[PDB]
Amino acid sequence: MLDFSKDFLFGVATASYQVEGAYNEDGRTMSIWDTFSRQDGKVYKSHNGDVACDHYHLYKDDVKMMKDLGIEAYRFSIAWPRIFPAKGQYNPKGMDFYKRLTDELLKNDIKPFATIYHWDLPQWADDLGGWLNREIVEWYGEYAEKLFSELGGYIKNWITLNEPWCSSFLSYFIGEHAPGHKDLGEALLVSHNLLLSHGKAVEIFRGLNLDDSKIGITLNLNEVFPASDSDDDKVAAQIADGFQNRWFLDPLFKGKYPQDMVEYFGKYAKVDFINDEDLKLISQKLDFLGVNYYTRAVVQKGNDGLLDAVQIDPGNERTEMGWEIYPESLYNILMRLKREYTYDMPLYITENGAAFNDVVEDDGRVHDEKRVEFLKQHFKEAKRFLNDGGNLKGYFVWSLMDNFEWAHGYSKRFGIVYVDYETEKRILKDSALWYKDLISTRTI
């Protein structure tokens, strides 16, 4: 009688540097993104997260707003530079914010899902080598252990990392994200140290044996289509799929990097970081996998260079990111996980959403009908996955509110709530009203 059971979690998601602001308050020191956004040319119009949505000060209003929407779960991230603003220097004032935030969530019947690392690495850590320095595994472990011990009574659902593909390849090879290096070998080593750090947190988590508490990781996944049935395009799609998806799915769930990608990358950079002991730590059993899904890719062979697939435009509708709106890949990826990687393990959609050109009209409303339709199409695919036997436990819309979209600054609006940054006023978009009805009726 319900398309989504009473226990299914309808959620929304944010991340610390994208919404919190208060960047220099209560002991917080700079992250790599505070630094990167101040480097000329790195972030749209030199936007930064000094203030963002001011969620640090407005969190009670923002929790009340989710309660009034009927939100059942809230995914947020915890800012490492608030908790350890200097190496080995714990900041209780930082922890106090996350205690009052999660206290407010629980008292309004919202289940907290905490991302431990969502890209705001402390600058002190980068200055010591950052994710390129294997000692980060211990720094990250000490940070995660402090969170588990201080917040375990508050938070029962933990996500070690958000989108390690971004923190590695987008940050160290492509150079769009902080710290902005452009070196394939560095990105590969960073991917390994990220996964090893995830593994250390899981090891610590299991040793604590926290009552009724679950840990997982969040991966951004796509689906790659070859532009034609040619051998050239099949190899192009295999490489693109290995670069985005299997490079992380295989070590996590198979205990082995994908050998075709090890050999492919090996022609261009060192891959000598691979070893049995590390892969055993990386592949420890998880309680759930979080899936971040936005779009697909249609790719054509390029010019035999490194990762040079041509991006094909199939001529369909797109968001303001240029991302094709292709809801069927949400179902296809969840099914692929069920059949190839996670089997009967619980899955959560930890991000899905879209950026459109949102305007407050003269009636004071944001009539974001393209986002209403986007979310409607994707929740219909979640429902189809459920009805086909998939183990989907919840769905977090990216984002609760418009926020700092990394290298795009505030120019891309993903919220179901509009934020007028001059006043920090929140305006419910029509997509939020649609979502409120979905949660209430559990019907689509």
Binding positions for Na ion, rule: CB under 5 A: 17, 20-21, 37-38, 46, 48-49, 52, 214, 285-288, 326-328, 346
118 annotated as belonging to a binding site for a ligand? yes
162 annotated as belonging to a binding site for a ligand? yes
- Do 375 and 353 form a contact (C-beta atoms < 8 A)? yes
Chain-centre distance for alpha carbon 355: 15
Active-site choice (20, 72, 104, 163): 163
User: Closest CB to Na ion among 81 and 242?
Assistant: 81
- Do 348 and 290 form a contact (C-beta atoms < 8 A)? yes
422 annotated active-site:
no
Q: How far is CA 217 from CA 118, 194, 279, 349, in A?
A: 11, 11, 16, 11
Give the DSSP H/E element, type plus range, for residue 352. Answer: strand 347-352
406 annotated as belonging to a binding site for a ligand? yes
Q: How far apart are CA 287 and CA 214, in angstroms?
A: 6
User: 214 - beta bridge partners?
Assistant: 157
Question: Omega before 399 cis (within 30°)?
Answer: yes
247 annotated as belonging to a binding site for a ligand? no
User: Closest CB to Na ion among 48 and 171?
Assistant: 48
The amino acid occupying position 427 is I
User: Closest CB to Na ion among 38 and 206?
Assistant: 38
- Do 248 and 219 form a contact (C-beta atoms < 8 A)? yes
Cβ 54 to Na ion, closest distance in Å?
9
Nearest Cα to Cα of residue 239 among 217, 268, 219: 268
Nearest Cα to Cα of residue 159 among 390, 355, 351, 407: 351
User: Closest CB to Na ion among 214 and 367?
Assistant: 214
294 annotated as belonging to a binding site for a ligand? yes
Beta-carbon contacts of residue 31 (< 8 Å; ≥ 6 apart): 17, 79, 80, 81, 120, 121, 122, 123, 178
Q: How far apart are CA 243 and CA 308, in angstroms?
A: 11
Cβ 354 to Na ion, closest distance in Å?
14
User: Closest CB to Na ion among 54 and 163?
Assistant: 54
User: Closest CB to Na ion among 20 and 163?
Assistant: 20
Structure tokens at 283: 């592949």
138 annotated active-site:
no
User: Closest CB to Na ion among 96 and 135?
Assistant: 96
Give the DSSP H/E element, type plus range, for residue 396. Answer: strand 392-398
Rounded to 10 deg, the angle between the 184-208 and 136-151 helix axes is 40
Q: How far is CA 382 from CA 3, 144, 296, 432, in A?
A: 10, 31, 16, 18
Q: How far is CA 220 from CA 22, 108, 236, 279, in A?
A: 28, 29, 20, 21
| Count of H-run helices and E-run strands, the chain | 17, 13
Active-site choice (104, 186, 223, 351): 351
Cβ 359 to Na ion, closest distance in Å?
24
User: Closest CB to Na ion among 108 and 332?
Assistant: 332
As a residue count, the chain comes to: 444
Cβ 191 to Na ion, closest distance in Å?
18
Binding residues for substrate: 18, 118, 162, 294, 398, 405-406
Q: Which residues are catalytic?
A: 163, 351
